Amino acid sequence: VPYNRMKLMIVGNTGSGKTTLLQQLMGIDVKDWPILVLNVWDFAGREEFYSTHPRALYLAVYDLSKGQAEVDAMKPWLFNIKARASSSPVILVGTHLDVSDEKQRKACMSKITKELLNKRGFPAIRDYHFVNATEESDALAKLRKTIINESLNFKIRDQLVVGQLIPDCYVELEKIILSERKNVPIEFPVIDRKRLLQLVRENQLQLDENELPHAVHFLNESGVLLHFQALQLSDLYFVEPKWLCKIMAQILTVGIISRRDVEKFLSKKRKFPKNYMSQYFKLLEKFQIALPIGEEYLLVPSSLSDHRPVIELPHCENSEIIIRLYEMPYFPMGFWSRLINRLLEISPYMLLRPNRMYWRQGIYLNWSPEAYCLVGSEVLDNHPESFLKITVPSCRKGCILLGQVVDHIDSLMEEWFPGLLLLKKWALYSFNDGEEHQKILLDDLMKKAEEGDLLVNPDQPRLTIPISQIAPDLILADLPRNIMLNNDELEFEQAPEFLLGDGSFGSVYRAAYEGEEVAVKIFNKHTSLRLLRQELVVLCHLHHPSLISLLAAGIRPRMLVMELASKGSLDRLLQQDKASLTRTLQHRIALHVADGLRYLHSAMIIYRDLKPHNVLLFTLYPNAAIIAKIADYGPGFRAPEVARGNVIYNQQADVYSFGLLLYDILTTGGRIVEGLKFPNEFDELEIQGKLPDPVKEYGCAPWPMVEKLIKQCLKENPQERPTSAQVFDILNSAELVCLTRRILLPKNVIVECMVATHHASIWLGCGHTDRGQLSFLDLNTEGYTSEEVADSRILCLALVHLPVEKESWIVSGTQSGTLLVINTEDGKKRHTLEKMTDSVTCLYCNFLLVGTADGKLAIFEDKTVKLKGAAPLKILNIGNVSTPLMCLSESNVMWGGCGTKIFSFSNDFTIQKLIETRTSQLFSYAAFSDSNIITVVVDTALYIAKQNSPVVEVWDKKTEKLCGLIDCVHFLREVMMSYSGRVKTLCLQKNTALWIGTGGGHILLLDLSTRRLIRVIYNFCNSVRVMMTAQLGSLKNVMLVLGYNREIQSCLTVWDINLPHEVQNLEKHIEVRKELAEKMRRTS
């Protein structure tokens, strides 16, 4: 709809009377003026808003009776206007003509015809008038006509350039919001409820990701409400303009003042939340009201004395100091307060606190007679131009100070006062102490710097000056010793065959430095020096192992010598050699990139460009201290948020990009990268966020943990995405590396036993129902079936393998005592062996050993079990009706548990010893010692776990003695009723790793050679049921951990058997790099 509102800006210097002018025509006095409704903002006072947060007409007003001096005073205003809205209309009105002779009128008339109306650099003043007085005038009648017609003309001009007129149509929903924001009654008008207000007005502009940002954008430009977009009080805090302006302006007037006393007053004036108060102070900085000095003080630039304090400097002879001048036509408004804010952090030691003094127009730092610094404004007669003077003592520390000062000045101007980049830079020098200084432009000194000569007096050769004394910042004399270029080491040709690449900065060549391969950036005639120094500022102070460091810089040919990667870009590797890209290598690359991001984010630097092209590899050797680095720190791969082209980049944009990198690493084919070849789908795909399952879609081997990390990372909402610090913490995990698969079982399925086929599937029992039900899991497809095969509940399964006969059978022992034997090659071949006198408690198998609940052990001949109703070879009575057999272990002598005794068998099945273990109660606790044995692990000692024990007993089988106890509670006691500490199962690996499962979702990794805790693996599931060691169909060894996850959920987790080693190796890797980070940062 045809929006008919436009802002009116009234500006001028203090004393003009322009407020009354407005009243006759009809911080800041804001009010509507229906004529066309103008939103009039009367900047009667010094409301920095015109620079601190800069469809409007600029009415400039000045007092004619003051004259031409005032006209010149308006140049900074005109500059600022052009600098933010060069296309905007400007009407210049002089006033108080009734007390100003026409001499002044025509003097000022000629003044503006000579210096403003036809002068570039000013925003082409559209018209002008002279007014007798604010009482009314024919001139004002004409002015009213001028303003109306010209504002119409302006919008016509916008249509010619922008494409919008004074009835330009804007989405009506935005118009509605304006009205909704108008209707707001809040005591402390800081708004967050806006989300609700959207919901109050039905739900308009529902594209929160696009329309909402546009509405907000409009609302600031239209002068309705204020976002403050890195402040905390920014996005969710829309504040009424009247309060922003009023309160901050008043507090200024309510010069060093302690923060706390300001807080005291403020708390009485307006009871802001202390959180808001911290932001309040940050806003005072942002809006140039007050600058932070120490953490307890504010400078308050405005109102500082403007009578440069008497300063006596040490050093007097010309050669003792260095002087630099900046010639300007006028200082921009706010130039000084911004400059001061930057200069306050200067320090010659950053590679005692200084006696600081403030002039408003200058800063004096003292430090020491050895090194001090004075920056301030000075003006000479017959030279209308104003200008800066910088003075430092001529020595290395003085140089360092100078470098920091001029870098801040140039950066200030590039960001805030472009257009000037005027700024005639002069250096002062003399050929003899006691004489006057001579001026020279730095450009000419640069011409001489290229020669490398001494400055020579053209009339007298005897008089020369080393350039460094005049301009030690043209020659890079302020570099750290560590990066000064040694010209006897650097070896390069600048020949075509060494060209590695180029850019707007010049070119890059391959070279040698101190015997190493390096890259040399050359600033080959591209506004050099300034670009060079900008790069030097960024490169220094960033010293992380994952970044490309600077290996010395040198002004003689203007070079940056940097580390050259030996294996090249990740991109190439992804499309060059998947064999190098092992699972181990991939993980390490992810860590190194994550560190770089964490570091740069803590350094307040947004990378904005992660991709395989920017990742460099320095060795493909998986176990190296440093493998990947991020290039050039300081396309179709964009976050969907920033892809809109209407928001601001931040760490969350980088995180999103990182997630995509990880996705690209996961699928080593670079399949989404291949998608780039069809960019119309590729860029949109990323925008949609609808990425395909990396496993299913590309045929990529499963990698859980990472898979969910990517999903967690790539969220639509920036506020829901993980921080880069968190991303790293997640990547920092042995579990991440070694977890390979996780299969959930169907809801309410309880498996009490497992048999993996050593040849890729698992036979599962089922204790959920009370019926003999046998299930089956296909690891190749995660397929699952199940059928009832017996009456009573299946207790134990065993695999009979007869490779000689080319067949195999599953033996199912159950509660009834029967043995159901089923051919694995033929489901129809089912038969039952001689029924046992009691239930089957365990199976082992060659002989099929059947341990029953009455302590009886049946031994069946290897092949005999094929026949239905077959009897065992022999039967032993080991225990009794109350002492069931529960474990037959063997690692050709058998060992096992019967009640509280440990038995052992010969190859003739004879008892070789009955070890009563109950006697261990002299140690530990009798209710733990006196309990049925659950499992026996046979190594160089026996490891016994008993039912409901928290302690594992270690026995010396050679002497039958207790040799130690393992307290599981203790280990988890160190870890900060899920902590039952009950031992569930024991598994043993011959590399000394001992795997102990427990009641809660924890797995302890112990070191058999020292009996020490390697690591606690936890938050696995609700409870661990069984653990198996099994070789997969790809010959990999893994742990099969079956657990409960009560909603009776249960699941199978597959771990890479080398977990114990990965835990230790990863830890080492990280610590080494941690030390290197400190090494680098400390050198500086």
Curated annotation (Swiss-Prot):
The chain holds residues 1330 to 2525 of 2527 of the full protein. Changing residue 627 to T: In PARK8; uncertain significance. Changing residue 973 to E: Decreases WD domain homodimerization. Ubiquitinated by TRIM1; undergoes 'Lys-48'-linked polyubiquitination leading to proteasomal degradation. WD repeats lie at residues 738-778, 783-823, 828-861, 866-906, 912-956, 977-1007, 1012-1056. It is linked to Parkinson disease 8: A slowly progressive neurodegenerative disorder characterized by bradykinesia, rigidity, resting tremor, postural instability, neuronal loss in the substantia nigra, and the presence of neurofibrillary MAPT (tau)-positive and Lewy bodies in some patients. Changing residue 14 to G: Decreased kinase activity. Residues 189-365 form the COR domain. Changing residue 416 to A: Impairs RAB29-stimulated kinase activity on RAB10, RAB29 and LRRK2. The modification Phosphoserine is found at residue 87. GTP binds at residues 12-19, 697-720, 880-883. Changing residue 969 to M: In PARK8; shows decreased WD domain homodimerization; no effect on kinase activity. The seven-bladed WD repeat region is critical for synaptic vesicle trafficking and mediates interaction with multiple vesicle-associated presynaptic proteins. It also mediates homodimerization and regulates kinase activity. The COR domain mediates homodimerization; it also mediates homotetramerization via interaction with the protein kinase domain. Serine/threonine-protein kinase which phosphorylates a broad range of proteins involved in multiple processes such as neuronal plasticity, innate immunity, autophagy, and vesicle trafficking. Is a key regulator of RAB GTPases by regulating the GTP/GDP exchange and interaction partners of RABs through phosphorylation. Phosphorylates RAB3A, RAB3B, RAB3C, RAB3D, RAB5A, RAB5B, RAB5C, RAB8A, RAB8B, RAB10, RAB12, RAB29, RAB35, and RAB43. Regulates the RAB3IP-catalyzed GDP/GTP exchange for RAB8A through the phosphorylation of 'Thr-72' on RAB8A. The active site is at 609 (proton acceptor). It comes from Homo sapiens. Residues 1-154 form the Roc domain. It is found in: Cytoplasmic vesicle; Perikaryon; Golgi apparatus membrane; Cell projection, Axon. This is Leucine-rich repeat serine/threonine-protein kinase 2. Belongs to the protein kinase superfamily. TKL Ser/Thr protein kinase family. It comes from the Eukaryota.
